């Protein structure tokens, strides 16, 4: 995948979305995110995976201060709320707007209208890995029909009977928790579903073309090596698109077959 | 008992120099007592009213459906003042009321109110205005049916 074509596509689609928005103008340009669309030669996963995978970016996403971050932890929520009040830096303290444990989530948000209100009150949801398996039932199809706001897995376990939440929270150190939270809020999300098409966030409209190209190439790199099964001979096509623009091709293969054994005369 | 540990905990809090509101939370209980419930209905604070069907004397609750209808309160007549007393830790409760519930039970309270409105009030809206009683005895009905049968035959 050549990067000159990637950057040329970046200026092309940026000029296109600018001339489309020109037809507040600056606000209409802003909050328009950029989608990286991968087409594969096979379904990327054999079943619906509801835990999104994280890709680390040199230029993090969600750096704006207006976002709302909702954190879901294990019991109790008291330890984490006092942690938010005392020992996080001010930027993360302002970014995190709600901390709620799994027990209170199941107690207060069993209603579909409650789930939709929680969906609309926040932009990005982070969730501890100790409880993320029970969250599809607790949050329903509201949080999982659309892959935009699926809970991002974070590790809050202190890495090594029934645990009493009031006595101990099994707490892992808080500055490295801060590092984990900023890593998760900066990482992009990839969602595995039984599909030949997947979509990954790489940037926004007002971002500049060379950081867009760097994000695109690195997201392609870890996406191919780590999560796409059978790697490049399973990779079929790569596209970059906006919410209202068409596909912009970046890499189109010469073969249409995963392997030569599929070729039967 | 629970009031005793609550007062002991508030005593410890005021001993170490904190307000009782710092250690105690806002309670959510079923409101009961006839004068209390009537005042809540008049002040439009009660969200749901349950009235016992067997209050003796009946004048204590005979105006409560009309009061609830004027003030727009969802009301329901239920069987058992002793059944309400089991709720309110008494032998007998003539009327109970919900003003507010917790955030975990907003939906359940709203669904119960809607179920009451659609399954009791709409079904008794026209039967509440009719006169009751007037049932004849067994022998009186048999004699009347025999008399009407004889009149039809003759």
């Amino acid at each position: 995948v050549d990067p000159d074509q990637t950057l040329k596509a970046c200026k092309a689609l940026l000029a296109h979305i600018k001339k489309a928005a020109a037809a507040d103008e600056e606000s209409t340009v802003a909050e328009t995110p950029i989608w990286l669309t991968l087409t594969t030669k096979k379904h990327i996963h054999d079943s619906h995976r509801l835990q999104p995978g994280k890709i680390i970016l040199p230029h993090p996403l969600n750096t704006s201060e207006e976002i709302s971050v909702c954190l879901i932890t294990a019991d109790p929520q008291r330890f984490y709320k006092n942690a938010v009040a005392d020992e996080f830096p001010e930027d993360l303290r302002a970014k995190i707007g709600r901390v709620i444990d799994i027990s209170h989530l199941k107690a207060k948000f069993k209603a579909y209208e409650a789930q939709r209100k929680l969906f609309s009150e926040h932009d990005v949801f982070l969730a501890d890995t100790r409880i993320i398996n029970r969250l599809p039932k607790a949050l329903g199809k509201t949080f999982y029909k659309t892959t935009t706001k699926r809970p991002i897995p974070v590790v809050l376990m202190a890495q090594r009977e029934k645990r009493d939440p009031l006595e101990n929270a099994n707490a892992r150190p808080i500055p490295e928790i801060v590092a984990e939270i900023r890593k998760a809020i900066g990482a992009a999300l990839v969602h595995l579903s039984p599909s030949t098409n997947t979509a990954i966030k790489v940037g926004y409209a007002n971002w500049e073309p060379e950081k867009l190209a760097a994000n695109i190439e690195t997201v392609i790199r870890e996406l191919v090596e780590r999560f796409v099964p059978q790697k490049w001979q399973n990779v079929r096509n790569f596209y970059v698109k906006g919410p209202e623009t068409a596909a912009l091709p970046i890499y189109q293969t010469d073969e249409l077959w995963l392997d030569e054994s599929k070729v039967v005369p | 008992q629970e009031k005793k540990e609550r007062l002991l905990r508030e005593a410890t809090a005021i001993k170490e120099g904190k307000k009782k509101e710092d250690v105690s939370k806002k309670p959510y209980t079923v409101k009961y007592g006839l004068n209390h419930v009537v005042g809540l209905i008049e002040n439009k604070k009660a969200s749901l009213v349950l009235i016992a069907n067997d209050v003796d004397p009946i004048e204590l609750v005979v105006f409560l459906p009309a009061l609830c209808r004027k003030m727009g309160i969802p009301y329901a007549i239920i069987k058992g003042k002793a059944r309400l007393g089991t709720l309110v830790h008494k032998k007998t409760a003539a009327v109970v009321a919900i003003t507010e519930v917790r955030s975990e039970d907003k939906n359940e309270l709203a669904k119960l109110i809607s179920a009451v409105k659609e399954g009791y009030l709409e079904k008794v809206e026209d039967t509440r205005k009719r006169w009751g009683g007037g049932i004849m005895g067994f022998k009186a009905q048999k004699r009347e049916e025999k008399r009407k049968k004889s009149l039809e035959t003759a």
């Binding site: 209208e113 | 002040n43 969200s47 003030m71 727009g72 907003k106 709203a110």
Partner: peptide, 23 residues
Amino acid sequence: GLKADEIIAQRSALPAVSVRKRA
């Protein structure tokens, strides 16, 4: 707001009758 909260808070158009001013 919530539909459940609106259902709980739904009342009639008659003004509330107060016996006395409450602190």
